[PDB]
Design an enzyme around this catalytic site. Structure first.
Site, PDB file in Angstrom:
ATOM      1  CG  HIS A 105      21.068 -49.467 -14.476  1.00 38.88           C
ATOM      2  ND1 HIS A 105      20.180 -50.291 -13.823  1.00 38.88           N
ATOM      3  CD2 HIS A 105      20.593 -48.208 -14.457  1.00 38.88           C
ATOM      4  CE1 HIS A 105      19.204 -49.501 -13.403  1.00 38.88           C
ATOM      5  NE2 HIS A 105      19.406 -48.244 -13.767  1.00 38.88           N
TER       6      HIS A 105
ATOM      7  N   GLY B 286      14.802 -42.129 -13.861  1.00 41.55           N
ATOM      8  CA  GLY B 286      15.529 -41.362 -12.857  1.00 41.55           C
ATOM      9  C   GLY B 286      15.268 -41.866 -11.446  1.00 41.55           C
TER      10      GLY B 286
ATOM     11  CB  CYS C   1      17.396 -46.457 -11.230  1.00 43.73           C
ATOM     12  SG  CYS C   1      16.359 -46.953 -12.618  1.00 43.73           S
TER      13      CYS C   1
END
Ligand SMILES: CN(C)c1ccc(N(Cc2cscn2)C(=O)Cn2nnc3ccccc32)cc1
Ligand SMILES: CN(C)c1ccc(N(Cc2cscn2)C(=O)Cn2nnc3ccccc32)cc1
Lengths: 304, 304
Positions: free
Chosen positions: B41, B143, B145
């Site tokens: 993503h 942030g 991830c």
């Protein structure tokens, strides 16, 4: 979202851990520049610990009696000195992995990370607080001595603790990196009992602010209080007195949540008087006090 | 003595964290050898997340659209591929700090450390467990991830988790390092509710063994039970069923303390039925389930 008892990344401190052996005693040392810091009781046998005369014991030791191993390589000791309860072993090689660092003496209520080590090798990292009675509740086994506590501000490691002992009650005592013990403890295996382990009120309030930010709001009540009224309740529950300095420190959390510090104090007063009633706050059934207001802001803002 | 929620030393994983930016999205990547792993993503805008077609979105991306920065130096991307929900960005430089590593897919109940990162920089490290509903209760902000979960066996890092998302309930979901989500979660911003978060029974029993080893013994009762009787109570309290495999795994803790596993089960049954009555175990007012039997042995034995 989510709130965890988070330790600082330990890498910068791992690169400083060494093994120090003197005679038959082995513990950990901290290698910064060309100096290795370790508890002075590395010179003691288990028998010596009952009543040690450190200056006298140190006379029988020379540089070559301190074996310092960094990884699987031996460091050459070219000098040694005792500063308070730590030994400073000057080596001929500066630690190439020395981070930017400071030695700080923390106040009770302040939190830090501990890198628990054995034989100069890191085993784990956890977060803890300097208790109001100057003990820490760590996880240390025999051989953990010389493991350090620290905080990190971007790239600078502030070393604040070095492990020296476990009291007969299972709580821990140690020094700053200048070798001065926190509290009244001494590096002798003798009757040393800790004072009252009171709750760090300002940290509990910071953690209640973290709970509100992370969605746990059930404990917010319709009341307010004053510092004096709150402190009458805090005294009854063995909580530290809250000062105007603590209220000022909670200002940013009060601003972010829109909950006045004294309103949060009134919520805490009700939790003390009524209990949790089987409910939890941030996955805890007790009021957590090992997060400072600075820790709550840091974690809730993602400081790296 | 003392028992803490201890994370693995994070240094070996810190040396692998990089920042990955694609368009206007920035998250973390894990650089091992000449491959950077990150959530797929990273190619999405916040709008795309509602209903993303990853294969279609990836067609509009070339190697030069993936910006990988390790510290303050840019890495050259020479290939990219999607494996399940992760992207593998082949770079022209092998990570010189690549530790010995394995990719493992953990089972629910297993614990691991998370190195929470933002912009490729480590912010903190904490210990957690893969819940029986395949969520984790972490501490992650936007942030985070691409932050990873791992265990360390001496010098080998076993990566087991990569962070991808936060469910609307504030719990976290992610994948193993092959990009397969734990549980039924998908990398889409849609209605995804977690199942029952049951208690990891074997971990609670391991933690009760740790409590006995560390001096907290008040909860030890005069009773025993059977697996079937205990499981009737465990079902009632949303605890996972205890199997003979779990009893076998607790064998070493049973041997060390001299408390038969079924006697500890009977103590746990009484704690479930009677509550704690305002008492604590290892400084907790609830039964802790994020320590495996292996964690209790490791911590109580000082494995480095
Ligand atoms: C040098 N020598 C062999 C030695 C031997 C024992 C100690 N003591 C005893 C002591 C001195 S004052 C109170 N108790 C320690 O407390 C060291 N220590 N630190 N954390 C520990 C956790 C578990 C077990 C031992 C631990 C110090 C030195
Ligand atoms: C790429 N893009 C801008 C983007 C934007 C948002 C997400 N989502 C939304 C989402 C997808 S499925 C359910 N929710 C995330 O959950 C990412 N994330 N992960 N941990 C977080 C903790 C706090 C806030 C955001 C967090 C993923 C990607």
């Amino acid at each position: 979202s989510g709130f965890r008892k988070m330790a600082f990344p330990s890498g910068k401190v791992e690169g400083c851990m060494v093994q120090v052996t003197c005679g038959t005693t082995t513990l950990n040392g901290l290698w910064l520049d060309d100096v290795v810091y370790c508890p002075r009781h590395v010179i003691c046998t288990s028998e010596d610990m009952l009543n040690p005369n450190y200056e006298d014991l140190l006379i029988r030791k020379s540089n070559h009696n301190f074996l310092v191993q960094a990884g699987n390589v031996q460091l050459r000791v070219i000098g040694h000195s005792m500063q308070n309860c730590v030994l400073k072993l000057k080596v001929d090689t500066a630690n190439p992995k020395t981070p930017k660092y400071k030695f700080v003496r923390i106040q009770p209520g302040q939190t830090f990370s501990v890198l628990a080590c054995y034989n100069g090798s890191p085993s784990g990292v956890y977060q803890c607080a300097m208790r109001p009675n100057f003990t820490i509740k760590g996880s240390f086994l025999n051989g953990s001595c010389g493991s350090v506590g620290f905080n990190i501000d971007y790239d600078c490691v502030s070393f604040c603790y070095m492990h020296h002992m476990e009291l007969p009650t299972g709580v821990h005592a140690g020094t700053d990196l200048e070798g001065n013990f926190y509290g009244p403890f001494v590096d002798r295996q003798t009757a040393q009992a800790a004072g009252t382990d009171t709750t760090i009120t300002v940290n509990v309030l910071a953690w209640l602010y973290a709970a509100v930010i992370n969605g746990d709001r059930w404990f917010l009540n319709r009341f307010t209080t004053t510092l004096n009224d709150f402190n009458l309740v805090a005294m009854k529950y063995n909580y530290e007195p809250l000062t105007q300095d603590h209220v000022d420190i909670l200002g940013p959390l009060s601003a972010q949540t829109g909950i006045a510090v004294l309103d949060m104090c009134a919520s805490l007063k009700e939790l003390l008087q009524n209990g949790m009633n089987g409910r939890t706050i941030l996955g805890s059934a007790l009021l957590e006090d090992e997060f400072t207001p600075f820790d709550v802001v840091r974690q809730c803002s993602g400081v790296t």
